[PDB]
Amino acid sequence: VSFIEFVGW
Amino acid sequence: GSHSMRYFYTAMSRPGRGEPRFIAVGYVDDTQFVRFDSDAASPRTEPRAPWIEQEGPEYWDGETRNMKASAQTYRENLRIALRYYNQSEAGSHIIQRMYGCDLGPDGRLLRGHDQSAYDGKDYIALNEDLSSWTAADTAAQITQRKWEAARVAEQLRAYLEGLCVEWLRRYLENGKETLQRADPPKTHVTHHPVSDHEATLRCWALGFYPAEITLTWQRDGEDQTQDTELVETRPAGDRTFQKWAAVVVPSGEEQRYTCHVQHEGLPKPLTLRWEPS
Amino acid sequence: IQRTPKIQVYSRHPAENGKSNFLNCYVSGFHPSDIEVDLLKNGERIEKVEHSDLSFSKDWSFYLLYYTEFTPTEKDEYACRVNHVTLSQPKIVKWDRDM
């Protein structure tokens, strides 16, 4: 199961 | 043996041809099990291995939603990268991401990974401590400062030590008949004259899984590393891999050469020679 | 900032004239990801060609497998034609049953 993004570059 | 799970993302901008394309693939060891492509007619996370098909609709709907969100994040990241490198909006650029977990033969977390690249060059990497970062340049240092302020490493650590390991173990159990089966190489040596006084000996390994393999030639028991042509391990299309190693040898000295094969599926390394018969 | 593709053209199983098989063209080591790959039979583009999903190696270079079902014969010539931004003209690699 994939990671949930929560921050950008 | 040891096992790993990895996700690979590629985000590719293309000014004048729509929003950046986002492609994600997931692997256990050398077996792909999911894909997502934002250019598909109906973008969805889709199965690519038989043992993942049993996951329920909640899995597929949730992974689709998550990959769509990740595509949006990486489109934003492409815009940010332009700012960080003083680049124009006219060029095409690529962000890549790889992350996941490695388990030892014991089954516990051996180590975690999370690395990103911009235009094919390292950008930022989570260190093995799962707590600090290595930035490749002064742009990535801006990202590093942002991620330190937001405590991003702590969330990655929680994912890599928790969900990543738990789901990898689930897949290894559900796919055990393939993921936990090593197929040894089928090996042989061919001989092809080059001239009246030289011939090529080619050592072949076919049909093996996983991809990791060592093929070496020795002359009089000494490795011939600098004189061996070694092709990249290549996929056969049936899950297995192929590789060969070749040396050019003086005619009449063929029996002084031995090929040595190491693979997880072999109880002991193989030694083979050219058999004129 | 760009890397040109390596190309291998080969069959899934050892070739035997008259026996169905798969022709593979494996392109790897390239960057950026846009690439055009055709499989050719006697110089003509084969229409039914599939490919793997885009992935990449630890050095960030991309790889793809293009493949099609085929039945080799003594006379038919097969090849892979690859175009990439790093190439000034398409590169054609012929299938050699011993490679």
Author numbering:
A (entry chain C): 1 to 9
B (entry chain A): 1 to 277
C (entry chain B): 1 to 99
From the study:
Allopurinol, widely used in gout treatment, is the most common cause of severe cutaneous adverse drug reactions. The risk of developing such life-threatening reactions is increased particularly for HLA-B*58:01 positive individuals. Despite the known pharmacogenetic association, the precise mode of interaction between allopurinol and HLA-B*58:01 remains unknown. Taken together, this data demonstrates that allopurinol, and to a lesser extent oxypurinol, may enable the loading of unconventional peptides that are normally suboptimal in forming stable peptide-HLA-B*58:01 complexes.
The PΩ-Trp residue of both peptides occupy their respective F-pocket of HLA-B*58:01, which is typical of canonical peptide binding behavior. The side chain of P5-Glu forms hydrogen bonds with Tyr74 on the α1 helix and Arg97 on the β sheet tightly. P6-Phe forms a hydrogen bond with Asn77 on the α1 helix. Two different protein batches of HLA-B*58:01-peptide complex were tested, the data showed the average melting temperature (Tm) is 70 °C for HLA-B*58:01-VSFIEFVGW and 57 °C for both HLA-B*58:01-VSFIEFVI with allopurinol, or with oxypurinol.
